[PDB]
Amino acid sequence: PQAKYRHDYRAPDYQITDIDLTFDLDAQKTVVTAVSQAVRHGASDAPLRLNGEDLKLVSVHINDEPWTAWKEEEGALVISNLPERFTLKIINEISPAANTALEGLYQSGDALCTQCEAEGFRHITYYLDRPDVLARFTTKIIADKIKYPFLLSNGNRVAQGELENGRHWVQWQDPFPKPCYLFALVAGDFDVLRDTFTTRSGREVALELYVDRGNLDRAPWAMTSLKNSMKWDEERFGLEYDLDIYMIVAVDFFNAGAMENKGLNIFNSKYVLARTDTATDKDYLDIERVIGHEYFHNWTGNRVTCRDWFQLSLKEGLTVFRDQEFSSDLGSRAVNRINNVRTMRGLQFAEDASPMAHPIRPDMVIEMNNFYTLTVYEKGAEVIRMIHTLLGEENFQKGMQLYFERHDGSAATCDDFVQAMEDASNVDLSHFRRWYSQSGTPIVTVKDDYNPETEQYTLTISQRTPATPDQAEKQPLHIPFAIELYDNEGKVIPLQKGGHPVNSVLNVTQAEQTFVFDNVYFQPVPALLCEFSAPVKLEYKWSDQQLTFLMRHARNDFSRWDAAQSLLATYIKLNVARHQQGQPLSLPVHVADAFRAVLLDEKIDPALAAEILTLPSVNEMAELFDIIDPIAIAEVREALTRTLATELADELLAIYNANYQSEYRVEHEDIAKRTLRNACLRFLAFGETHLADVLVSKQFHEANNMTDALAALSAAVAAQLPCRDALMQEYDDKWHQNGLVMDKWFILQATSPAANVLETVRGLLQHRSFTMSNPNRIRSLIGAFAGSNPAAFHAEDGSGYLFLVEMLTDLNSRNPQVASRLIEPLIRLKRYDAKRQEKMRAALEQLKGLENLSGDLYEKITKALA
Numbered sequence: 132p133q134a135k136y137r138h139d140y141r142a143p144d145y146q147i148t149d150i151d152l153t154f155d156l157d158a159q160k161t162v163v164t165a166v167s168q169a170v171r172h173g174a175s176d177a178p179l180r181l182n183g184e185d186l187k188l189v190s191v192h193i194n195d196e197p198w199t200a201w202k203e204e205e206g207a208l209v210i211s212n213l214p215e216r217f218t219l220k221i222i223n224e225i226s227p228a229a230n231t232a233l234e235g236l237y238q239s240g241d242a243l244c245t246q247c248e249a250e251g252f253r254h255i256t257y258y259l260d261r262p263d264v265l266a267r268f269t270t271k272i273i274a275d276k277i278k279y280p281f282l283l284s285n286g287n288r289v290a291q292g293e294l295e296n297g298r299h300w301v302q303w304q305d306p307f308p309k310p311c312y313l314f315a316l317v318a319g320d321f322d323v324l325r326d327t328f329t330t331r332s333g334r335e336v337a338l339e340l341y342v343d344r345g346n347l348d349r350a351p352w353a354m355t356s357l358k359n360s361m362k363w364d365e366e367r368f369g370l371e372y373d374l375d376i377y378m379i380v381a382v383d384f385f386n387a388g389a390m391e392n393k394g395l396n397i398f399n400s401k402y403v404l405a406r407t408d409t410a411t412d413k414d415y416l417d418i419e420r421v422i423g424h425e426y427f428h429n430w431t432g433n434r435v436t437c438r439d440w441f442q443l444s445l446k447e448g449l450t451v452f453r454d455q456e457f458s459s460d461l462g463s464r465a466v467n468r469i470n471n472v473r474t475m476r477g478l479q480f481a482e483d484a485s486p487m488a489h490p491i492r493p494d495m496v497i498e499m500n501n502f503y504t505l506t507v508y509e510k511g512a513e514v515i516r517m518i519h520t521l522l523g524e525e526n527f528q529k530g531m532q533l534y535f536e537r538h539d540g541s542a543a544t545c546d547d548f549v550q551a552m553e554d555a556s557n558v559d560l561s562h563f564r565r566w567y568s569q570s571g572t573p574i575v576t577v578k579d580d581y582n583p584e585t586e587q588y589t590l591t592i593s594q595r596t597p598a599t600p601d602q603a604e605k606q607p608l609h610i611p612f613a614i615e616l617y618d619n620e621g622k623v624i625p626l627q628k629g630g631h632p633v634n635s636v637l638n639v640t641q642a643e644q645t646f647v648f649d650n651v652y653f654q655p656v657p658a659l660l661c662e663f664s665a666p667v668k669l670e671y672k673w674s675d676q677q678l679t680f681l682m683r684h685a686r687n688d689f690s691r692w693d694a695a696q697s698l699l700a701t702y703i704k705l706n707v708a709r710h711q712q713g714q715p716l717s718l719p720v721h722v723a724d725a726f727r728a729v730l731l732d733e734k735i736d737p738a739l740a741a742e743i744l745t746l747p748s749v750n751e752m753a754e755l756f757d758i759i760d761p762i763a764i765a766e767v768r769e770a771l772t773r774t775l776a777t778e779l780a781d782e783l784l785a786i787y788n789a790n791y792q793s794e795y796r797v798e799h800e801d802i803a804k805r806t807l808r809n810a811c812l813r814f815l816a817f818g819e820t821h822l823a824d825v826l827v828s829k830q831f832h833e834a835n836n837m838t839d840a841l842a843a844l845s846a847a848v849a850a851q852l853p854c855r856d857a858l859m860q861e862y863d864d865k866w867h868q869n870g871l872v873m874d875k876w877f878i879l880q881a882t883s884p885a886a887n888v889l890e891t892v893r894g895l896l897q898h899r900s901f902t903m904s905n906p907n908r909i910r911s912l913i914g915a916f917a918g919s920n921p922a923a924f925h926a927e928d929g930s931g932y933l934f935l936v937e938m939l940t941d942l943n944s945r946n947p948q949v950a951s952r953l954i955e956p957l958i959r960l961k962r963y964d965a966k967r968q969e970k971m972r973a974a975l976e977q978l979k980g981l982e983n984l985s986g987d988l989y990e991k992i993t994k995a996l997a
């Protein structure tokens with residue numbers, strides 16, 4: 132399989148302006164007829180090269196003439212000797228029922244549905260399957276009326292008929308030109324929740340959610356969130372929906388979470404269905420997120436699309452930034468920012484050090500599905516956020532307005548988006564463009580000095596980005612670096628220099644620079660890189676007392692949480708070294724005290740309290756070390772939890788009882804209290820065992836909602852409490868017919884600290900609720916084991932590696948995209964010790980030898996073995 136390179140982009144030799152599709156639908160054998168109006172832009176001898184994969188070609192006509200001047204090659208139909216404008220007609224056959232990879236047209240339970248992003252439409256018919264080719268689609272669907280009473284495609288329903296033999300048909304027309312990745316089709320039998328939203332200028336939009344029969348009672352939250360998304364995008368970005376109908380269909384078999392197909396989003400049912408006894412606060416808020424996100428693509432991705440797939444972040448980074456703003460405006464911004472920072476530092480940084488490292492705009496791709504990444508998404512968004520930080524909201528919105536004004540109806544690049552922001556704002560972003568083209572995490576080192584003679588504070592800030600596997604050359608970035616200076620009472624000290632105020636977002640543009648501040652009337656405690664103002668690693672020599680001070684006094688809630696993380700980091704590192712020498716945990720008392728103080732601050736927002744009392748995950752802890760010892764990290768996290776539980780026992784139980792809530796509400800104050808209560812529970816679970824067991828079984832049995840019940844179950848598993856087995860059995864007894872709810876149970880099993888966890892995981896491949904044919908199940912058991920039980924996955928005997936190789940040997944042929952998600956923990960081998968490396972290298976070499984090795988895995992494996 133061949134790499135493609137961004138620098139090789141060229142305008143296509145042919146365009147298609149309109150396509151009329153006919154599906155004669157059948158699970159075994161669907162016949163597709165595609166009539167496309169085309170225009171040659173290139174030279175008369177440049178043939179039309181159409182992409183196609185696993186298609187059975189039946190005929191080819193040009194202006195109704197059977198065409199003889201063509202040939203099929205690997206992945207393509209190449210057609211010669213064409214006129215400048217012509218109608219192309221292709222008839223071909225495909226087989227949805229055989230599509231296990233879930234790309235193109237496939238079967239989800241009894242339904243048929245599509246997934247076309249990125250290059251899945253070529254699995255449906257021969258086409259210019261590239262997103263710079265935009266066309267007006269009309270879609271006629273013909274099918275068995277009893278099996279497929281609902282037949283859906285993009286746009287408006289314009290025609291319909293009955294036929295003999297129990298068949299019917301419907302035709303759809305989508306008036307907005309689109310790249311084919313935005314094509315969708317769905318056929319099946321559903322319950323439909325119907326509502327409307329009226330836009331600020333008065334357009335009434337029919338809203339339709341299609342769910343499996345019986346699930347209508349789990350749909351209203353998603354409907355509500357769609358309405359909230361549409362409203363917010365009007366209030367914040369001034370953007371209105373542009374069609375008269377908005378459809379979402381929830382399907383159980385889907386590789387990703389959701390898809391923004393124009394006017395017909397297709398969603399993994401995981402991010403639609405909720406009821407208070409099946410879904411947690413977190414599920415409610417994820418559903419909010421994803422509904423929002425796909426909706427926001429309607430403009431940032433659909434009305435303006437991507438010129439080529441290397442520009443993916445233009446839509447994903449920007450649309451992530453939007454879904455974060457949405458969540459943040461509606462919920463707690465601090466909690467949003469916090470969790471988003473956890474993800475950047477604990478997962479994205481890891482990827483940006485891995486063999487798969489890439490800039491947010493990749494320069495080289497073998498399999499484009501491997502680039503739907505933390506980097507393109509999460510770091511993409513941080514890059515957009517830095518633009519926001521440099522421009523301020525008002526110029527940023529001007530920038531958005533120019534972007535649309537210029538590019539509505541077309542396919543754009545990252546550089547276009549940057550240029551619009553620069554032209555509207557008058558802020559120069561030529562240096563800043565470097566963030567699109569350079570991989571890896573910059574490291575920013577800060578040194579300070581206070582001069583009591585001059586009342587000056589001097590910061591010397593330096594930056595470097597270490598080389599990455601993909602890039603030997605690195606250069607300085609334009610880093611927005613926000614600071615605040617605190618005096619000894621915790622008040623902010625005005626930043627100024629030579630009589631004049633100074634913006635507190637510093638422009639760190641060089642390898643090294645000095646900034647001098649005047650009238651600093653006391654030696655300051657600095658808050659640095661406030662709000663995570665740039666996606667960088669900060670190197671500064673805090674004292675513990677600076678950090679506890681910031682925990683008490685910092686103006687932004689983010690800086691308080693962040694300071695607590697810097698406090699813990701030190702002692703996490705200490706205790707990992709200790710663990711490797713067989714020593715128990717050591718923690719100075721004033722650390723426990725900072726946490727006690729948080730527990731008892733009556734004025735702190737319980738949302739914030741709760742995040743501070745949520746210890747860094749093992750993945751966040753991993754990023755503190757050059758070489759990861761996953762066992763020591765895990766055991767230290769446990770011991771820290773044990774220590775704090777013991778030291779803060781009375782306080783924890785007090786706060787636990789005080790945040791009791793009789794009523795269950797999906798409301799931000801209630802969620803916050805409850806998130807704090809269950810954080811308290813989690814520590815208590817690791818205290819005195821009799822009390823722990825009582826508390827946890829009691830919460831599980833008395834919970835009136837899944838959030839409280841799952842937090843108990845999860846604590847029973849984590850702390851291996853006596854009630855554990857009985858509670859897990861009850862959950863299975865009650866919930867086994869429900870895959871989505873079971874996924875929770877599988878994750879708990881897979882991430883158990885128990886000694887025989889691997890053995891249990893293997894057994895669960897045969898569980899009544901598991902199947903290898905559903906990505907959700909695969910991800911919830913196997914993926915959670917490899918990615919989220921690093922202590923077991925990295926067992927010194929290598930049994931974790933072998934187990935994954937077995938699973939990937941199946942998935943490489945069944946569903947390579949899920950395979951490629953799942954291989955990721957293996958391609959991190961260079962972060963681990965030599966002996967684990969040798970075993971992971973051997974596993975990868977075994978996979979490299981598979982017959983019919985997929986491209987998706989080949990790309991990752993060769994990079995990892997290089």
Ligand SMILES: CC(C)C[C@H](NC(=O)[C@@H](O)[C@H](N)Cc1ccccc1)C(=O)O
Pocket residue numbers: 248249387388389390391420421424425428447451454500503508
């Ligand atoms: C909240 C979102 C970040 C959820 C996310 N979905 C998306 O980004 C959709 O906008 C994507 N356009 C769907 C997608 C994902 C992977 C490969 C091809 C297509 C997902 O993981 O499904």
Ligand code: NA
Pocket residue numbers: 146147148263264265266
């Ligand atoms: Na076109």
Ligand code: NA
Pocket residue numbers: 391428431432433436446
């Ligand atoms: Na899009």
Ligand code: NA
Pocket residue numbers: 459460461462463464
């Ligand atoms: Na808010």
Ligand code: NA
Pocket residue numbers: 578579580581
């Ligand atoms: Na100093």
Ligand code: NA
Pocket residue numbers: 693694696697
């Ligand atoms: Na920190």
Ligand SMILES: [Zn+2]
Pocket residue numbers: 424428446447450
């Ligand atoms: Zn997206």
